[PDB]
Amino acid sequence: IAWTIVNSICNMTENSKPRFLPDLYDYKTNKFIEIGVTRRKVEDYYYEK
């Protein structure tokens, strides 16, 4: 069901499809979001993903 929600968006608005599962998607900017918050500060998990 998660990928059906992703693909339904990309069909009408001709955009890229990600490899792994996103968590959110903004309809104004047309950008996917991938959450990954943790006990580390910022740079150790930002540049890894």
């Binding site: 990928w3 059906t4 693909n7 339904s8 069909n11 499809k17 490899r19 599962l21």
Partner: protein, 730 residues
């Protein structure tokens, strides 16, 4: 809109039964409850249909049939009833309802259905545009082989084809995976465009694509052409005793045409060698032969296949041999040897398995490119020697790197570090290793290895670092600053007079043709292949037996040298032909000299082996070997075998399972205890009598003196008494 679907779901959820099933049963569990049924699979559908077609209302149909067609037609036939079909909301219906629909029902647009059912309509397109030749009658030998049954398949895996189908008909419900290959993307664009705005069940479109795209095979008995479009029409083109010549519509693929051209040329060269004037015979066959109805000579003028037999045919007609190619921007030109192909997977230094079309055998190239040239000597995964020269050291070294990769050594494969990925047209795997080593070759040269050489004036070595050394060099590398002619016996040579191509060194691997070959030649038999040669040759001897038997008695040297035995000789090993002829002729003259002993079957059996200049050797033979479709078969000298079987019950000689004709009924009542024409300089007398000593093998027969009798293991578990005759035969 999607308004009525959610409205009905609300109406279903209002029902307390349906809301329970919809909530309790999961998506994975829905596949089980979908197939939940009282209905058995019918054991005897043929009986039930005959039972049910006598009934008024045997067909079940959707309840909405009551709103579409009338209850009664113009002749008062009841078309539908209100009786629900056991276990559904469908209603029981007359066959007259189906007829009423087909004559007076709602019309719909179905003009693009031939694109949905393309696999089916392609069969009619090939048949409609097909061309029939004549029907020849003969014993059709059929090899049981795995072959394609789905012509025009765009070759993908089941999972790859599943992704393509999903993209075309269910675009919104494609999973995590995406279209990987450029084949998958281009097929999807074509399918999306062809099938757009076509009112038909998506279930049926998914089904027809699954059948069309994916390759399917079956074990079938095939005579002749094995390619998909000929396999499609086996029922039409072959029977037990006939071949209906037929070319399907559309053009043959180059793969099938190159494979069958090689087989045609090989068969033409193998035939010509054993004739008196090979080049005239080869030329005679080349102008008469056709492949897929296209003449062989215009194929040889346009087709660039590089193969020893094809090149002998090209050389005999004065056509340029495709002697050259390019790789890394250098023109390779073969001056000696030959290329033999073998696709295999090998591990690199990064443990990456990759399928390489590796070349084998000893070859020699004169290589030349931009500002540098070389003389390469190569073997199977071996750089034997490379003498390189050029305007600059970099130009020499750049050519050197190209040759080292072109050699396909295990040195250079193991010296690769990392994964190989280049481009969005992706190149073949030879260029993946080249472009890797063109960028960085630090490990290549370290792992290649050095060798010591003698200081020759003009030659110098190239070290791993890049220095020029005089007495040291990389393994094989040295640095230093085409018409053809073909003789009567098909030997291809150069201006200097050195051997380029030999008929003896043509590959003996037959293989079954992909497209039909017709040699319209008196030098060849009616049907292609080696089983045909056996059957037609033995059929011919029986048919003309009365003429050839008296010709056997009076003047045997003209019988032995008959041109009809020449095809048979291709099946005998080259080396064996002479000694086999020596053995056969000695055995035949024994039958003439030892009066009384005459066996018509034994003459007929061995007669084709005579057709060669005989050797003076004294070896014994319990069988003659015959090469039939790769495997060796052994025709036994005494009695029946797979290759030759005289059946007394039928009064028929069976050659490889097929009756070859009845010999005269005289030969049933034709025998004598003494059997000549089995062992050279000996005579089989009768049963094994133990008075004359213990059993000797056929190799041990040299011990026995002149006129001495002994027991021998002759063949097929029989032990037999044999005497050495005193005076030997001509």
């Amino acid at each position: 809109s999607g308004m009525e679907r959610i409205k009905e779901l609300m109406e279903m959820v209002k029902n307390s039964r349906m809301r329970e099933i919809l909530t309790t049963t999961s998506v994975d569990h829905m596949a089980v409850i979908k197939k939940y049924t009282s209905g058995r699979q019918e054991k005897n559908p043929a009986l039930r249909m005959k039972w049910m077609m006598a009934m008024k209302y045997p067909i079940s149909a959707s309840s909405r049939i009551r709103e579409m067609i009338p209850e009664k037609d113009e002749d008062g036939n009841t078309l539908w009833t209100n009786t629900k079909d056991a276990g559904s909301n469908r209603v029981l219906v007359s066959p007259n309802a189906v007829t009423w629909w087909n004559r007076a029902g709602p019309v719909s647009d179905v003009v693009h259905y031939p694109r949905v059912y393309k696999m089916y309509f392609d069969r009619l397109e090939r048949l409609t545009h097909g061309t029939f030749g004549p029907v020849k009658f003969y014993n059709q030998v059929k090899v049981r082989k795995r072959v394609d049954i789905n012509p025009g398949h765009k070759d993908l895996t089941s999972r790859e084809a599943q992704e393509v189908i999903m993209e075309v008909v269910f675009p919104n419900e494609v999973g995590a995976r995406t279209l990987s290959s450029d084949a998958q993307l281009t097929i999807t664009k074509e399918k999306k465009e062809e099938l757009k705005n076509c009112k038909i069940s998506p279930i049926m479109v998914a089904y027809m694509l699954e059948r069309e795209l994916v390759r399917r095979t079956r074990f079938l008995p095939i005579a002749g052409a094995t390619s998909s479009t000929y396999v499609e029409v086996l029922h039409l083109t072959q029977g037990t005793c006939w071949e209906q010549q037929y070319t399907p519509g559309g053009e043959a693929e180059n793969d099938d045409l190159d494979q069958t051209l090689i087989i045609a040329s090989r068969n033409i060269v193998r035939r010509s060698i054993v004739a008196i004037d090979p080049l005239a015979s080869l030329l005679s066959m080349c102008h008469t032969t056709s492949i897929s109805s296209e003449p062989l000579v215009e194929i040889l003028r346009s087709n660039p296949t590089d193969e020893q037999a094809v090149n002998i045919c090209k050389a005999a007609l004065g056509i340029r041999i495709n002697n050259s190619f390019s790789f890394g921007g250098y023109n390779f030109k073969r001056v000696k040897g030959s290329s033999q192909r073998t696709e295999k997977a090998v591990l690199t230094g990064n443990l990456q398995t990759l399928t390489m079309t590796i070349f084998e055998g000893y070859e020699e190239f004169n290589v030349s490119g931009k500002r540098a040239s070389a003389v390469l000597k190569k073997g199977a995964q071996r750089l034997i020697q490379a003498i390189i020269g050029g305007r600059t050291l970099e130009d020499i070294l750049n050519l050197m790197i190209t040759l080292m990769v072109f050699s396909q050594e295990e040195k250079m494969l193991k010296a690769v570090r990392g994964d190989l990925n280049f481009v969005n047209q992706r190149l073949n795997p030879m260029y993946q290793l080249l472009r890797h080593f063109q960028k960085d070759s630090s490990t290549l040269l370290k792992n290649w290895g050095t060798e010591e050489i003698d200081p020759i004036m003009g030659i110098a070595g190239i070290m791993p670092d890049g220095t020029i050394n005089k007495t040291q060099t990389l393994m094989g590398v040295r640095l230093s600053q085409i018409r053809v002619n073909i003789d009567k016996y098909l030997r291809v040579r150069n201006e200097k007079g050195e051997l380029l191509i030999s008929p003896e060194e043509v590959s003996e691997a037959q293989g079954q043709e992909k497209l039909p070959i017709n040699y319209n030649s008196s030098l060849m038999w009616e049907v292609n292949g080696p089983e045909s040669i056996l059957t037609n040759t033995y059929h011919w001897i029986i048919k003309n037996w009365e003429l050839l038997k008296t010709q056997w008695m009076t003047d045997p040297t003209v019988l032995y040298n008959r041109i009809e035995f020449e095809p048979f000789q291709t099946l005998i090993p080259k080396g064996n032909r002479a000694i086999y002829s020596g053995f056969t002729r000695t055995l035949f003259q024994q039958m003439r000299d030892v009066e009384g002993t005459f066996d018509s079957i034994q003459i007929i059996k061995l007669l084709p082996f005579s057709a060669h200049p005989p050797s003076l050797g004294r070896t014994q033979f319990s069988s003659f070997t015959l090469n039939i479709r790769g495997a060796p078969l052994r025709l036994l000298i005494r009695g029946n075998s797979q290759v030759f079987n005289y059946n007394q019950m039928e009064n028929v000689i069976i050659v490889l399972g097929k009756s070859v004709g009845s010999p005269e009924r005289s030969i049933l009542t034709e025998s004598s205890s003494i059997e000549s024409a089995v062992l050279r300089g000996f005579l089989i007398l009768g049963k094994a009598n133990s008075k004359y000593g213990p059993v000797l093998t056929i190799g041990e027969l040299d011990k026995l003196g002149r006129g001495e009798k002994a027991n021998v293991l002759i063949g097929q578990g029989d032990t037999v008494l044999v005497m050495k005759r005193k005076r030997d035969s001509s």
